[PDB]
Symmetry: none
Subunit: 45 residues, 12 copies
């Protein structure tokens, strides 16, 4: 169960994330005003 | 279960994420005002 | 289950993400005002 | 299950993503005001 | 299941994505106001 | 299942994507106001 | 050298520019959404 | 050398510029959403 | 050398610039959302 | 050399700039959301 | 060399700049949300 | 060399700058949210 409240950002954000990663499974994400990522990585072998 | 509240960003965002990644499975994403990514990576072998 | 609330961005975004990735499976995405990407990468071998 | 709320972007976006990727399967996308990409990459061998 | 809400972009977008990719299967896309790409790449051998 | 909401872009877009890609299967696309591309690339050998 | 930018006005305008003057040489002008005036009243006696 | 930026006004304007003057050489002007005036009243006797 | 930035005004304006003056050479001007004036009243006797 | 920044005003403006003056050479100006004036009243006798 | 920063004003402005003066050379100006004035009244006798 | 910072004002302003003066050369100015003035009244006799 997930819920969130409304918000208004007057200021100016800058997001410059230099991510890096090596894996059997990899996901990389960088979003602006709003986002919900529900990623399920189930692996075998 | 996922829910979010409405928001209004008056300011000007800039997002310059220099992501990098090597994997059996890879997903890369960078979105502006709003996005929901539901990625399921299930692997075998 | 996924839901989101309405939003109005008055400001001017700029998104210059220099992504890079090598994989058995690869997806790359960069969207503006709104997007939902539901990518399932299931691999074998 | 995916749903999104309506939004009106008064500001002017610029998106210059220099993506690059080599893979068995590859998808690359860069969209403006709105898009939903549901890509399933299932591979074997 | 996918659904989206209506939106009106008053501002002027510019999208100059210099994508590049080599693969067994490759898809490249860059769209303006709205698009939904549902690409399934299933490979063997 | 895919659905989208109506939108009216008052501003003037410019899209100059310099895409490039070499593959067993290749698709390249760049559309203006609206488009839905459903491409299935199934390969063997 | 001179140059101008672009603006879109969806609101409604009502201009009522009353004016009066003497005239050894006189220019009087009124205009709506757009207009450029370059005048030189060079006189000799 | 001169240059200008771009602005979009969705609100409504009402201009009533009354004016009066003497005139060995006189310029009078009024305009709405946009306009550039460059005048030189160079006189000799 | 001169340059300008960009602004968007959703509020409503009402300008009533009354003015009066003598005139060996006189310039009078009024404008709405945007405008650039460059004048040189160079006189000789 | 000159330069300017960008501002967005959602509030409403009301300007009433009354003025009066003598004039061996006179400039009078009034403007709304944006405007740049560069004048040189260079006189000789 | 000159430069400026960016500001967003959601409040409402009301300017009433009354003024009067003598004029061997006179400049009078009033403006709303934004404006840059550079004037040189260089005179000779 | 000159430079400026950025400020956002959500409150409402009311400016009434009355002024009067003699004028062998006179500059008078009033402005709202933002503005830069650079003037040189260099005179000779």
């Amino acid at each position: 169960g997930s819920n969130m409240g409304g918000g208004m950002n007057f200021g100016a954000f800058s997001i410059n994330p230099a991510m890096m990663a090596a894996a059997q499974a990899a996901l990389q994400s960088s979003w602006g005003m709003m986002g919900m990522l529900a990623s399920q990585q189930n692996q075998s072998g």
